[PDB]
Amino acid sequence: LWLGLRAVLVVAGLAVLLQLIRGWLSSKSYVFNREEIARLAKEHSGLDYEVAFSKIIVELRKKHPGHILQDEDLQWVFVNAGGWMGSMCLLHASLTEYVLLFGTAVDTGGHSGRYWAEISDTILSGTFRQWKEGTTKSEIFYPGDTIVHEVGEATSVQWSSGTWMVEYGRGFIPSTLAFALADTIFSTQDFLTLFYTVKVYSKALLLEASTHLSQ
Amino acid sequence: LWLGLRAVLVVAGLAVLLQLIRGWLSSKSYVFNREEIARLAKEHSGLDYEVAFSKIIVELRKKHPGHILQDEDLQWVFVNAGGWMGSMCLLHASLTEYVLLFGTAVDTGGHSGRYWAEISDTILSGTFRQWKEGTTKSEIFYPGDTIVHEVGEATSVQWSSGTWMVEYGRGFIPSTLAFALADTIFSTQDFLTLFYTVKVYSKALLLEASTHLSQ
Amino acid sequence: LWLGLRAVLVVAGLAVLLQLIRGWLSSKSYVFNREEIARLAKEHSGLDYEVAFSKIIVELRKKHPGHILQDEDLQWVFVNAGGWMGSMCLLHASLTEYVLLFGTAVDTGGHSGRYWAEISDTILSGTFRQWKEGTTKSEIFYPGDTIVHEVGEATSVQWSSGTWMVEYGRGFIPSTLAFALADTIFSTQDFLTLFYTVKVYSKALLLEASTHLSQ
Ligand SMILES: CCCCCCCCO[C@@H]1O[C@H](CO)[C@@H](O)[C@H](O)[C@H]1O
Ligand SMILES: CCCCCCCCO[C@@H]1O[C@H](CO)[C@@H](O)[C@H](O)[C@H]1O
Ligand SMILES: CCCCCCCCO[C@@H]1O[C@H](CO)[C@@H](O)[C@H](O)[C@H]1O
Ligand SMILES: [Au+]
Ligand SMILES: [Au+]
Ligand SMILES: [Au+]
Ligand SMILES: [Au+]
Ligand SMILES: [Au+]
Ligand SMILES: [Au+]
């Protein structure tokens, strides 16, 4: 049973790390809340979505200083995952929370991904078709609506050519990256997009760590 | 010539297993039939696809007792493959045959897959666009039609947001799994859906084995 | 230094090969021209795309004899890449240039791929939606238009059910293959299509090498 040392170690480490991370997540104080982002995004859920982006970033920097990236560190990064393709503008990210502006300028759709995070999306423009698991019918959501993709849930997502939304996620953020880059690794092979994603996540993490040091 | 032992061994094993499986397929008595399933689905291709599903499952359990899964073992499982995403309800499966209810509640499309099985789909609702290999034109099929994906053939499939059909496949069913789970491994990473697929296939195989023991 | 022998060798080989390939591309005469292919395709972008294909192939074989594959070596091969699925008819290909007739008979879309080649597409029929990186809006191109996918650029492409175009690429063609087969390896697993792609590329390379031997 000597070679079972590695297997027992892996099982015990997974159990211990799950216990630690889950207790942390359920006892951790959080910066943002889904209702906050939802109200902020629904206030600006209009036709013009670029002005909505600007106003939302301004409000977030006003009510949460030191937690939103500066304009210098902002860039739209492609996101290929689950068979769909969109783009993201990451405003805030940590090990447990993230806030971004997501959306697509083309018709896409695929698997939503099943990860260890709860994600709220408030549509600013476009249409969002969601197909829940185990059903045979889907629902369409319009600007102003907010869809909550809960932890462990898997749905089919679909977006029209002009869809843009504000997204807030809470959970274990690194695990979500494993999904968010899968198609980038095995389908698109856009290594520059992989670098951009890692770079923006690292910049957000460094901002969050720098704010903690001053406090 | 020890380094060449592995290559000769695998080639010989592949040839022997291919001949054995093909002789089995040419000698095996079959439970279902393509024309039978097509006729059964065509009987109700005028109804709501859920009513059609109910009546088809009832008729299958009547005409083939001991070969269709119990309602307790029935569940809709997502299916991501070839760039498309749908869902399945597996009613019967063996090493050589399978019967299921397939379809999507979103607009999808992709590669049909090229495997060692013949697959018949009878559309109950929606639209089914098929693009055969080597051509520059596609064809759309409507409720009541039956599409035959032959062995070794590869086409492009596309389905609208409300498409549902009855599907019967015959051949070497395990050979298909490599395709039916590929996107689940490298794109969606939905290992829970992979577990569900393995679970329903194992339940169908165990049902088929249990029916053989009583006879 | 022993653990670094492989790493030092790989670094030196990559540097030497990059310099060699760049000096070759800078010191190589080219067979085709981007404006030439664009003009030839736009002159016939008013006909049925099959008649356009025929006339374009005739003109290419007239103005460039010995560089376009014979009709016996021409076949439509499926192309699954970046999440989209179309088909190609390769007319000319070398290590530095390629000319083909691309398009899809289904509605598809995905990642354009980011490789080391500049690619011009002249739409003969259908519609072509392109979404550039860093932007929030896409543009639609119609028959007669020419899209230039530059080196290092990454976009989102989308095509309607009847889209067909003439495509000319120049750069390091092998670098593109890594993209053009990703979905074929990890999603569709249509290894017969992979064989067809390798076969047509090898036929084009052998034709181009045979033309050099006579000269
Ligand atoms: C995200 C793309 C949305 C496209 C909107 C198409 C107009 C409505 O489409 C309908 O939506 C229903 C539920 O979603 C589907 O079940 C129906 O099949 C479909 O006709
Ligand atoms: C390639 C498939 C083209 C389908 C055309 C659908 C009708 C056009 O649709 C419009 O096209 C614009 C251009 O990107 C988008 O910005 C808009 O969001 C979209 O509504
Ligand atoms: C699967 C959903 C299909 C949507 C129906 C679109 C209306 C018909 O669309 C037509 O069908 C033809 C055959 O497929 C295509 O070749 C044409 O390009 C397309 O215009
Ligand atoms: Au941005
Ligand atoms: Au932004
Ligand atoms: Au079911
Ligand atoms: Au069912
Ligand atoms: Au051809
Ligand atoms: Au052709």
* Per-domain boundaries in chain B: 1-30, 31-214
Please report the atom of ligand 3 found closest to the CA of residue B109.
1
Q: How far apart, in whole angstroms, are the C-alpha atoms of residue A56 and residue A39?
A: 11
Which H or E run contains B177? helix B173-180
A65 phi and psi angles, rounded to 5 deg: -70, 145
Q: Does residue B186 sit in helix, strand or coil?
A: helix
Check: CB of residue C119 under 8 Å from CB of residue C100: no
CA A151-A154-A160 angle, 5° bins: 115
> For residue A88, what are the CA distances in angstroms to A45, A147, A162, C136, C163?
17, 17, 14, 10, 29
Q: Are B203 and B69 in contact (CB under 8 A)?
A: yes
d(CA A154, CA A162): 24
Q: B125 contacts in A (CB within 8 Å)? A: none
SS3 content of chain A, % helix, strand, coil (to 5): 40, 30, 30
Structure tokens at A131: 């197909």
Backbone phi, psi, residue C114, to 5°:
-120, 105
Which amino acid makes up residue B48?
Answer: D
For testing the chain A interface, which of B160, B190, B193 should be mutated: the one with the most A CBs within 10 Å?
B190
In sequence order, the 6+-apart residues with CB closer than 8 A to the CB of C176 are C113, C115, C116, C117, C169
CA distances from C56 to B31, C127, C159 (A): 53, 20, 22
Nearest residue, CB atoms, B156 vs list C85, C189, C192: C85
Q: Distance of CA B193 to CAs A184, A196, B88, B184, B197, Å?
A: 21, 30, 11, 8, 6
Residues B205 and C20: their CA atoms lie apart, in Å, by: 58
Topology classification of domain C32-214: Jelly Rolls (2.60.120)
Tokens of C133: 């990186």
Residues 6+ apart with CB under 8 A from C97: C30, C31, C32, C168, C169, C170, C173
Do the beta carbons of residue A198 and residue A93 sit within 8 Å? Answer: no
Both tokens of residue B176? Answer: 């298909």
CB within 5 A of ion ligand 9: which residues? C 89
Alpha-carbon dihedral sign for residues B69, B75, B76, B82: negative
Task: Write the CB contacts of A30 (distance below 8 Å, at least 6 apart in sequence).
Answer: A96, A97, A170
Distance B139 CA to ligand 3 centre (A): 8
Question: How far, in Å, is the centroid of ligand 2 from the Cα of B106?
Answer: 19
Name the burial class of residue B109, with classes exposed (0-12), middle (13-18) and buried (19+) by CB atoms within 10 angstroms of its CB. Answer: buried
The CA-atom distances, in angstroms, between A52 and each of A35, A49, A165, A201 are: 18, 5, 10, 23
Fold assignment, B31-214: Jelly Rolls (2.60.120)
SS3 C169: strand
